[PDB]
Design a protein around this ligand. Structure first.
Ligand SMILES: CCCCCCCCCCCCCCCCCC(=O)OC[C@H](COP(=O)([O-])OCC[N+](C)(C)C)OC(=O)CCCCCCCCCCCCCCCCC
Ligand SMILES: CCCCCCCCCCCCCCCCCC(=O)OC[C@H](COP(=O)([O-])OCC[N+](C)(C)C)OC(=O)CCCCCCCCCCCCCCCCC
Ligand SMILES: CCCCCCCCCCCCCCCCCC(=O)OC[C@H](COP(=O)([O-])OCC[N+](C)(C)C)OC(=O)CCCCCCCCCCCCCCCCC
Ligand SMILES: CCCCCCCCCCCCCCCCCC(=O)OC[C@H](COP(=O)(O)OCCN)OC(=O)CCCCCCCCCCCCCCCCC
Ligand SMILES: CCCCCCCCCCCCCCCCCC(=O)OC[C@H](COP(=O)(O)OCCN)OC(=O)CCCCCCCCCCCCCCCCC
Ligand SMILES: CCCCCCCCCCCCCCCCCC(=O)OC[C@H](COP(=O)(O)OCCN)OC(=O)CCCCCCCCCCCCCCCCC
Ligand SMILES: CCCCCCCCCCCCCCCCCC(=O)OC[C@H](COP(=O)(O)OCCN)OC(=O)CCCCCCCCCCCCCCCCC
Ligand SMILES: CCCCCCCCCCCCCCCCCC(=O)OC[C@H](COP(=O)(O)OCCN)OC(=O)CCCCCCCCCCCCCCCCC
Ligand SMILES: CCCCCCCCCCC1=C(C)C(=O)C(OC)=C(OC)C1=O
Ligand code: SF4
Lengths: 105, 70, 47, 80, 169, 104, 318, 98, 156
C-alpha cells in the first residue's frame, strides 16, 4: 500500500531530504555527492534486481566513501608497519612528519 | 544619607569592572597588542590557520605584509 | 480449561469497571514570629 | 462590533492587544511595499562563489569582468 | 588521550547507560540519564553539532528530564544486589570491549569497527561564512513545509490528548 | 579546550566551596544532639506537561533567526506564523477546556 | 595565561555577590526610611566578610537527608551553573567567544532547576518537596517567555552570537524597538530567580515555610551566593540584550564602565522592586504567566517574525 | 567503521536490555526508553554531521520533539496508573490476565 | 608564645564575625513583640548592627523570647530552641519571660523562660523599651566578644 499520492498530485512532500545529492541549501555539497550521484544514475530505471548486480561497483565505491572502512584498514596497516619499524629501529621519521618544516601556504 | 550606599555600590562596580577589563587586556597581551581573532565560521579559521602557517613562528597574530613578498 | 496454575482467575466484571480500591492535614504557624508568633492552626487542605 | 470591542477592551485588554498585534503581523506584509526588498536582499547576498561560465561565443548578458556594465546590479541596494 | 576525546566521552556515555539501566531507583535513574545526556551531548558538540548539542541541553535535559524528575517527585517516596551486579557486569563487558579494540585495532561484535581515533574520518574542507548544520536546521521552514505541518499537528494533538486522558472523565 | 578548562575550573571551585561548607563547620566540635506518600496534585503535573509541550513548540521555533535569511520568504513566513499560531491554539485549547485552573 | 583570565572572571563574581548582600541591605534600608549596616565596617563594608565567616562556621543545621549524594550535588550544580552563565557574556569581549552564547545561556539556565529539585529530594520533608515542586513549576513556567522573548529579540540580531548584539545596538538601544519584550523580559527574569514579588519559597503562600518545621537543608550561603550570581548575571544579560552600550574597539574600558553602570542600576532596580510590592499568590503568578505574558509574547513573536520582512530590515547572519 | 558508533550502538542495546528487563517501576521503564531515544539522537547526529548531509540536520530535532511528546504521553499514563494504585509498580498492572 | 597568639587572634576573628552578624529568631509571644518591632523600626534599627530583621527560624543565632511563656507553649519554645544550630543564645525580654512578671502567680504561666531554656541576657521591663532591648543586644555582643573558645581549647 505505497499509495504514491506525491507523484499523482505532483506535490513534493519528502523527496528533498531523501538523498544527499538533492538540492541543498546554499548549494552545500555532501562528502559523497559524486559517488551517490553515480550510484543513483547507474541504478535508475533498471529496478532493484538488476541494480544489485549491474551497479555493484558504484555501490561499493559509495559505501566505501560513506564508511571509509578500507581507508581506515589501509591506514591501520601503514601505521602498524610504521610503528613496527620504529620498534625495530630501521626507520626514522622525516622532518615533514615531525613538525619542523613550516607548512606550505 | 542616601550617598552612604555608594561605597558598597562602588566596590560591587569595581568587582564587575575587573572581568571585562581583565579579558580585554589579556586578549591584547596574548595576541600582539590587538584584539583576539574571532573565528565563528570555518572561513575565518581557514584564514587564521593560513596566518599561523605564513608567519613562520607558529603564531597567527604575527602579521606578514608587503615586506614578506619580493 | 482451568488448571492448577490458573485456578485463582475470577472472571472479569460486566461493565469492565473496578472499584477504585484523601486530603492533606497541615499544622500551621506564622512564618516569622514577630507579628503574631503565638498562632497555631490545624488545616485540612485539598491541594 | 463596536460595543463588544469596547467591552472586551475594558475587560481583557491584554487579549485585545494580543489579537491586534498578531493580526497586524499576519496581514501587514501583504500590504507592505518593502516586502519585495527583503526577497531581493536575501537573494543578492553572495554566500557561495559565483562560478563562471564557459564563453561559447554568444552570451551578451553575461559580463567578462565584475566592473562591466552588463550583469545584475545593486544600485537599488545602495540607494533605496 | 586528547585525540581520543570523543571515544573517552563515548565510554563515559556507555558507563552512564549501564549506571541507570541497572535501575537502582527512578531518582538515581534520572540522575544517571542526566549525566549520560551531558556526556553524549559532549560527543555531539565535538563533531560540530553545536545547535543540536544545545538542543539536548535546552530541550532534552532542560524540559523533558525536568518533567521526569518532577513526576518522579510525585510518584515515589523518599527515605542492592541485582543493580550493582548488573552494573559491574556491564562495566566488565565494556572494558573488555575497550581492551580488545585497543589491543587489536579491529573488533567485530555485530559490525567491524576501527581501533584508531575517529578524527581520521572527518573532512578537510571549510564551509565558508555559515555552519552547514545551522543552515540545514534553518531549512526546516523553507524546505520542510510538510515536516513542520505534521510536527505542529502532532504537538497540538499531543496537547489535546494529554488534556483528554488526564481529565479522568 | 578553553571551554573545557573553564568548566573544569568552575566545577572545581564549586566542589571546593561545597567541601569547605561541609567540613569547616565540623572543626568547631559541637555537642552530640540527642533530644528528638505526598498528596498527588493533577494541576502540578498538568503545568509540567504544558511546559514540556510548549517547550517542544519552542524547540520548533528556535531556528527562526537563521530561517529569516532564506530566499523562500513567503513559505518561511507562512510556516513561522503557522508555528506560532499552533502554539497559540495549543494555549487556547489549554485555556478553554479548563486546563489552566487554580494554577492559571 | 588563560587560567588567569578564568580566575579574574570567577573570583570578582564571588566578590560582587558578597557585596550585593551589602548593597541590598543598604538600599532596602534607605528605601524603608532606615539605614542598612554601618557599624560592622566603615560604612558597613565589613558586613559581608563578617556574615560569610559566621555562616561558614555555623553548625550543620539539625537533621539528616534522604539522598546524601544529591544533597552534595545540588550546591555543586547551583554554583557551577551560576559561574558558567558568565563565560559567553560580552563585556566588551566574552571569555569563551562562542557562536551560540545566547542559546548556551538559555540552556544552562534551563538546567538550573535541578538544584531546586534535588534539594527537594534531599530533604526528608514531604512538604518541602511540595514547595520545591512549586518553585520548579514557577521557574519552568517563566522559562517559556524567556525563550520566546529571547528569540523575538534575536530576530533583530541575525544570530545567537552575544558579541554581535553589541554591533546590533550601535545606532539605538534595542529597548526602543522592543520595550514590551523588554518589560515582560524584566519581569520574567525577576520571576526566574525566585525574587520578590515572586519569591514563594522565601516567603508566605507556602506550605513548608512555617516556624518549627523539618527539612534538613544545605549550607544556606552556597545556594544564596549562586542565587545572587544568577541575579547579577541576568541583569548583565538584560543590559547586553536591550541596553547595549557604545563600544570603541581601541578603548574597551568605555564599554566596560558603561555596561557596569547600567547593570548596577538594573540590579538596584531589582532591589527597588522587591521593596515596593507585596507577594503574588502562586496561582496569581501562574495566571500572570499563562494568561497575560504568553499571549502577548506569542503576538510579539509573530510581530518580530513578520516585521523585518515587511520593513526589509533582516539582520545579517555573520 | 567508526569506533564511536560501536559505543553508541552498545549504549542503545544497554538501554534496550534495561527497557527489556523491568525491575519494579514504570518510571525506570520510561527512563530506559528515553535513554534509547538519547542514543538514537546521538547516533543520528554523528552520522549526519559526519556525512555533511545538510538537510538531515533538522532530522534529530524532529526525533527529539516527537519522542519527547511520546514521553509526555507516557508520563500521563504513569500518572493515571499512580492515581489508580498509589505506586507506579508494574505488578499492580496485571488485571488483564483474566 | 606563638600558638597562644594564633588561637587568641582566631578567637578574636570568630567572635567578631559572630557578634557583628547576629541573626535573631523572635518569639512574638506578647506585648514585647511590639517593642522588638520598634527595635527594628527606623529609629533604633537592629539591621545596622548586622542584626537582621525576620531571619529564618532554621538558621538563627539568638532566640529572643519576647512575651509571656505560658504552659501551653513551653514545649514549642523548647523544640524551637533545640532546632537551633550552635552557638545559639537566648535573650529574655520583659518581666514575663524573665520571671513570670505580672502573671507570675498564674496557673498557666511558666515562671520565667529560664525554666525552659538556658538564658544569656535578661532584659527587664514591661515592656523594656526598644532602646533597652537594643542595649541588651549590645550587651550580648559584649558577652560574645569576650568568649575564649579556641583559647580554652588550646589550654585543655
Ligand atoms: C574564604 C571564605 C571564608 C572562610 C572562613 C573564614 C576563615 C576562618 C575559618 C577558621 C575559623 C577558626 C576555626 C573554626 C572555629 C573553631 C571555633 C571553636 O570553638 O572551636 C572549638 C573546637 C573544639 O573546642 P573544644 O574541645 O573546647 O570543644 C568544646 C565544645 N564541646 C564541649 C561541646 C565539645 O576547636 C577545635 O577543634 C580547633 C580547630 C582548629 C583551630 C585552628 C588551628 C590552626 C589553624 C590555622
Ligand atoms: C495547512 C497548510 C498551510 C500551508 C500550505 C503550504 C504553504 C507553502 O508555502 O507551500 C509551498 C511549499 C514550498 O513550495 P515552493 O513554492 O517554495 O517551491 C519552490 C521549490 N523549493 C522549495 C525547492 C525552492 O510547500 C510545497 O510546495 C509542498 C508542501 C506543502 C504541500 C501542501 C500541504 C497541505 C497540507 C494539508 C493538511
Ligand atoms: C529591561 C529594562 C526594564 C524594562 C521595564 C521594567 C521596569 C519596570 C518594572 C515595574 C515594576 C513591576 C513589578 C512586577 C509587576 C507584576 C504585575 C504586572 O505588571 O503584571 C502585568 C499585567 C498583568 O495584567 P493585570 O493583572 O494588570 O490585569 C488583570 C488581567 N486580567 C483581567 C486577565 C485578570 O499586564 C501585562 O501583562 C502587560 C504586559 C506588558 C504589556 C506590553 C504592552 C504593549 C502594547 C503595544 C500596543 C498595544 C495596543 C493594541 C495594538 C496596537 C497596534 C498598533
Ligand atoms: C575589589 C575590591 C574588593 C575589596 C574587598 C574588601 C572591602 C573592604 C576593605 C577594607 C575597608 C577598611 C577596613 C578597616 C577595618 C577596621 C580596622 C581597625 O581599625 O581595626 C581595629 C582592630 C583592633 O585594633 P587595635 O590595635 O585594638 O586598635 C586600638 C588602637 N587604639 O584591629 C583589627 O581588627 C586588626 C586589623 C584588621 C584589618 C582588616 C582590614 C580589612 C580586611 C578585609 C578583607 C579583604 C580586603 C581586600 C583584599 C584585596 C585588596 C588588597
Ligand atoms: C488573526 C491573526 C491571528 C490570531 C491568532 C493569534 C493570537 C495571538 C495571541 C495568543 C493568545 C492565546 C490564547 C487565546 C485565548 C482566547 C480565548 C479566551 O481567552 O477566551 C476567554 C476570555 C474570557 O476569559 P475567562 O473565561 O473569563 O477567564 C478568566 C480570565 N479573566 O474571552 C475573552 O477575553 C474574549 C477574547 C475574544 C475577543 C477578542 C477580540 C480582539 C479583537 C482585536 C482587534 C482585531 C484584531 C484582528 C484579528 C482578530 C482575531 C480574533
Ligand atoms: C551531576 C553531574 C555534574 C553536575 C555539575 C557539572 C555539569 C553541569 C554544569 C556544566 C555544563 C557543561 C556543558 C558543556 C557543554 C556546553 C555547550 C557548549 O559546548 O557550547 C559552546 C560551544 C558551542 O558554540 P560554538 O561557538 O558554535 O562552537 C565553537 C565553534 N567555533 O561549543 C564549544 O565551544 C565546544 C567545546 C568542546 C566541547 C565541550 C564538551 C564538554 C565535555 C562534555 C560535557 C561535560 C559535562 C557533563 C555533564 C553535563 C550536565 C549533565
Ligand atoms: C541474557 C540476557 C540479559 C543480558 C544481561 C545479563 C546481566 C546479568 C543479569 C542476569 C539476570 C539477573 C536478574 O535477576 O535479572 C532480573 C532483573 C530485574 O529483576 P529485579 O526486580 O531486579 O530482581 C528480582 C529478580 N528477578 O533484571 C535487571 O535488573 C536487568 C537490568 C538491565 C540492565 C542491563 C545493563 C547491561 C547488561 C549487559 C549488557 C546486555
Ligand atoms: C600569627 C598572626 C596571624 C594568625 C592568623 C590570623 C590572620 C588574621 C585573622 C583576622 C584578624 C584577626 C583579628 C580580628 C579582630 C580583632 C580586634 C577586634 O575584635 O576589633 C573589634 C573592632 C570592632 O570593635 P567593636 O567592639 O565591635 O565595636 C563596637 C561598635 N563601635 O573590629 C573592627 O574594627 C573590624 C574587625 C575586622 C576583622 C578583620 C577583617 C575580617 C577578616 C578578613 C580576613 C578573613 C576573611 C576572608 C574573606 C571572607 C569571605 C569574604
Ligand atoms: C559568600 C557571601 C555570603 C553572604 C551572606 C549574606 C546573607 C544576607 C544577610 C541578610 C539576609 C537577607 C538580605 C535575605 O534576603 C534573607 O532572605 C530572606 C536572609 O535570610 C533569612 C538574610 O539573612
Ligand atoms: S513583660 Fe509585660 S509588657 Fe512585656 S510582654 Fe510581658 S506582659 Fe507584655
Amino acid at each position: 500500500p505505497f499509495f504514491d499520492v506525491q507523484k499523482k498530485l505532483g506535490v513534493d512532500l519528502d523527496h528533498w531530504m531523501t538523498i544527499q545529492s538533492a538540492e541543498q541549501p546554499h548549494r552545500i555539497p555532501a562528502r559523497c555527492h559524486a559517488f551517490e550521484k553515480e550510484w543513483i544514475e547507474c541504478a535508475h530505471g533498471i529496478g532493484s534486481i538488476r541494480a544489485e548486480k549491474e551497479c555493484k561497483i558504484e555501490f561499493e565505491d559509495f559505501r566505501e566513501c560513506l564508511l571509509r572502512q578500507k581507508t581506515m584498514k589501509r591506514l591501520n596497516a601503514i601505521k602498524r608497519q610504521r610503528d613496527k619499524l620504529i620498534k625495530e629501529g630501521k626507520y626514522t621519521p622525516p622532518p615533514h612528519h615531525s613538525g619542523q618544516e613550516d607548512l606550505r601556504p | 544619607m542616601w550617598f552612604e550606599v555608594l561605597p558598597g555600590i562602588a566596590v560591587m562596580g569595581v568587582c564587575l569592572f575587573i572581568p571585562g577589563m581583565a579579558t580585554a587586556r589579556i586578549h591584547r597581551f596574548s595576541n600582539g597588542g590587538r584584539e583576539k581573532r574571532v573565528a565563528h565560521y570555518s572561513y575565518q579559521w581557514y584564514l587564521m590557520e593560513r596566518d599561523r602557517r605564513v608567519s613562520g613562528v607558529n603564531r597567527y597574530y604575527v602579521s606578514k605584509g608587503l615586506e614578506n613578498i619580493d | 480449561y482451568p488448571t492448577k496454575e490458573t485456578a485463582h482467575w475470577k472472571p472479569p466484571p460486566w461493565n469492565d469497571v473496578d472499584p477504585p480500591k484523601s486530603n492533606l492535614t497541615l499544622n500551621f504557624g506564622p512564618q516569622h514570629p514577630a507579628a503574631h508568633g503565638v498562632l497555631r492552626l490545624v488545616m485540612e487542605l485539598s491541594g | 462590533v463596536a460595543a463588544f470591542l469596547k467591552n472586551v477592551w475594558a475587560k481583557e485588554p491584554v487579549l485585545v492587544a494580543s489579537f491586534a498585534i498578531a493580526g497586524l503581523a499576519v496581514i501587514l506584509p501583504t500590504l507592505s511595499p518593502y516586502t519585495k526588498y527583503s526577497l531581493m536582499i536575501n537573494r543578492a547576498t553572495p554566500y557561495n562563489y559565483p562560478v563562471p561560465l564557459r564563453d561559447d561565443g554568444n552570451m551578451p548578458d553575461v559580463p567578462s569582468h565584475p566592473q562591466d556594465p552588463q550583469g545584475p546590479s545593486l544600485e537599488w541596494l545602495k540607494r533605496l | 588521550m586528547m585525540t581520543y576525546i570523543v571515544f573517552i566521552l563515548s565510554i563515559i556515555f556507555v558507563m552512564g547507560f549501564v549506571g541507570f539501566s541497572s535501575k537502582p531507583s527512578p531518582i538515581y535513574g534520572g540522575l544517571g540519564l542526566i549525566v549520560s545526556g551531558g556526556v553524549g551531548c559532549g560527543i555531539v558538540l565535538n563533531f560540530g553539532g553545536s545547535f543540536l548539542g544545545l538542543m539536548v541541553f535546552l530541550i532534552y535535559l532542560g524540559g523533558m528530564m525536568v518533567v521526569f524528575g518532577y513526576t518522579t517527585a510525585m510518584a515515589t517516596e523518599q527515605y542492592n544486589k541485582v543493580v550493582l551486579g548488573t552494573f559491574i557486569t556491564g562495566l566488565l563487558m565494556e572494558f573488555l570491549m575497550v581492551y580488545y579494540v585497543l589491543k587489536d585495532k579491529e573488533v567485530e561484535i555485530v559490525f567491524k569497527f576501527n581501533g584508531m581515533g575517529d578524527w581520521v574520518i572527518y573532512d578537510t574542507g571549510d564551509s565558508g561564512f555559515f555552519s552547514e548544520e545551522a543552515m540545514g536546521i534553518a531549512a526546516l521552514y523553507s524546505y520542510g513545509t510538510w515536516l513542520v505541518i505534521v510536527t505542529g499537528w502532532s504537538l497540538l494533538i499531543g496537547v489535546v490528548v494529554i488534556m483528554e486522558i488526564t481529565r479522568g472523565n | 579546550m578553553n571551554l573545557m578548562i573553564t568548566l573544569l575550573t568552575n566545577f572545581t571551585l564549586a566542589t571546593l566551596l561545597v567541601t569547605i561548607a561541609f567540613w569547616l563547620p565540623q572543626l568547631n566540635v559541637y555537642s552530640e544532639k540527642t533530644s528528638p506518600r505526598l498528596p498527588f496534585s493533577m494541576k502540578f503535573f498538568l503545568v509540567a506537561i504544558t511546559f514540556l509541550l510548549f517547550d517542544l513548540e519552542i524547540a520548533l521555533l528556535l531556528p527562526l533567526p537563521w530561517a529569516s535569511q532564506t530566499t523562500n520568504l513567503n513559505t518561511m513566513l507562512t510556516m513561522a506564523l503557522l508555528l506560532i499560531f499552533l502554539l497559540a491554539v495549543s494555549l487556547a485549547y489549554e485555556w478553554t477546556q479548563k486546563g489552566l485552573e487554580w494554577t492559571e | 595565561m588563560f587560567m588567569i583570565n578564568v580566575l579574574t572572571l570567577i573570583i570578582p563574581i564571588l566578590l560582587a555577590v558578597a557585596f550585593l548582600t551589602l548593597v541590598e541591605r543598604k538600599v532596602l534600608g534607605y528605601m524603608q526610611f532606615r539605614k542598612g549596616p554601618n557599624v560592622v565596617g566603615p560604612y558597613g563594608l565589613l558586613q559581608p566578610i563578617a556574615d560569610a565567616i559566621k555562616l561558614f562556621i555555623k553548625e550543620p543545621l539539625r537533621p539528616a537527608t534522604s539522598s546524601i549524594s544529591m544533597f552534595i550535588l545540588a550546591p555543586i550544580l547551583a554554583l557551577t551553573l551560576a559561574l558558567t552563565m558568565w563565560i559567553p557574556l560580552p563585556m566588551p569581549y566574552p571569555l569563551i567567544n562562542m557562536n551560540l552564547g545566547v542559546l548556551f545561556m538559555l540552556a544552562m539556565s534551563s538546567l538550573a532547576v535541578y538544584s531546586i529539585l534535588w534539594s527537594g529530594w534531599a530533604s526528608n520533608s514531604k512538604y518541602a518537596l511540595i514547595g520545591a515542586l512549586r518553585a520548579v513549576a514557577q521557574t519552568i513556567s517563566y522559562e517559556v517567555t524567556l525563550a520566546i522573548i529571547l528569540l523575538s529579540v534575536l530576530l533583530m540580531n541575525g544570530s545567537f552570537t552575544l558579541s554581535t548584539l553589541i554591533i546590533t545596538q550601535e545606532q539605538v538601544w534595542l529597548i526602543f524597538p522592543a520595550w514590551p519584550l523588554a518589560m515582560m523580559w524584566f519581569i520574567s527574569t525577576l520571576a526566574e530567580t525566585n525574587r520578590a514579588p515572586f519569591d514563594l519559597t522565601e516567603g508566605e503562600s507556602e506550605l513548608v515555610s512555617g516556624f518549627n518545621v523539618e527539612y534538613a537543608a544545605g549550607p544556606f550561603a552556597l545556594f544564596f551566593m549562586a542565587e545572587y550570581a544568577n541575579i547579577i548575571m541576568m541583569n548583565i544579560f538584560t543590559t547586553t540584550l536591550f541596553l547595549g552600550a557604545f563600544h570603541n574597539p581601541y578603548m574597551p574600558e568605555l564599554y566596560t564602565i558603561n555596561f557596569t553602570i547600567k547593570s548596577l542600576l538594573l540590579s538596584i532596580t531589582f532591589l527597588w522592586i522587591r521593596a515596593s510590592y507585596p507577594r503574588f499568590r502562586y496561582d496569581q503568578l501562574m495566571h500572570l504567566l499563562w494568561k497575560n505574558f504568553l499571549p502577548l509574547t506569542l503576538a510579539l513573536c509573530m510581530w518580530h517574525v513578520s516585521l523585518p520582512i515587511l520593513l526589509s530590515s533582516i539582520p545579517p547572519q555573520t | 567503521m567508526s569506533l564511536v558508533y560501536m559505543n553508541i550502538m552498545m549504549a542503545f542495546t544497554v538501554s534496550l536490555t534495561g527497557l527489556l528487563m523491568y525491575r519494579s517501576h514504570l518510571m525506570s521503564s520510561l527512563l530506559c526508553l528515553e535513554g534509547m531515544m538519547l542514543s538514537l539522537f546521538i547516533l543520528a547526529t554523528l552520522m549526519i554531521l559526519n556525512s555533511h548531509f545538510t538537510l538531515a540536520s533538522m532530522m534529530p530535532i524532529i526525533l527529539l520533539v516527537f519522542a519527547a511528546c511520546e514521553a509526555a504521553l507516557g508520563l500521563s499514563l504513569l500518572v493515571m496508573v499512580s492515581n489508580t494504585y498509589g505506586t507506579d509498580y508494574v505488578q499492580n498492572l496485571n488485571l488483564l490476565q483474566c | 608564645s606563638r600558638g597562644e597568639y594564633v588561637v587568641a587572634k582566631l578567637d578574636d576573628l570568630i567572635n567578631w564575625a559572630r557578634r557583628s552578624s547576629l541573626w535573631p529568631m523572635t518569639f512574638g509571644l506578647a506585648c514585647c513583640a511590639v517593642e522588638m518591632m520598634h527595635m527594628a523600626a527606623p529609629r533604633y534599627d537592629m539591621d545596622r548592627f548586622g542584626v537582621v530583621f525576620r531571619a529564618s527560624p532554621r538558621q538563627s543565632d539568638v532566640m529572643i523570647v519576647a512575651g509571656t511563656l505560658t504552659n501551653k507553649m513551653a514545649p514549642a519554645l523548647r523544640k524551637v530552641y533545640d532546632q537551633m544550630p550552635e552557638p545559639r543564645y537566648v535573650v529574655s525580654m520583659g518581666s514575663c519571660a524573665n520571671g513570670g512578671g505580672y502573671y507570675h502567680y498564674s496557673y498557666s504561666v511558666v515562671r520565667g523562660c529560664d525554666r525552659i531554656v538556658p538564658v544569656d541576657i535578661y532584659v527587664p521591663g514591661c515592656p523594656p523599651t526598644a532602646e533597652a532591648l537594643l542595649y541588651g543586644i549590645l550587651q550580648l555582643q559584649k558577652k560574645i566578644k569576650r568568649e575564649k573558645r579556641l583559647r580554652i581549647w588550646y589550654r585543655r
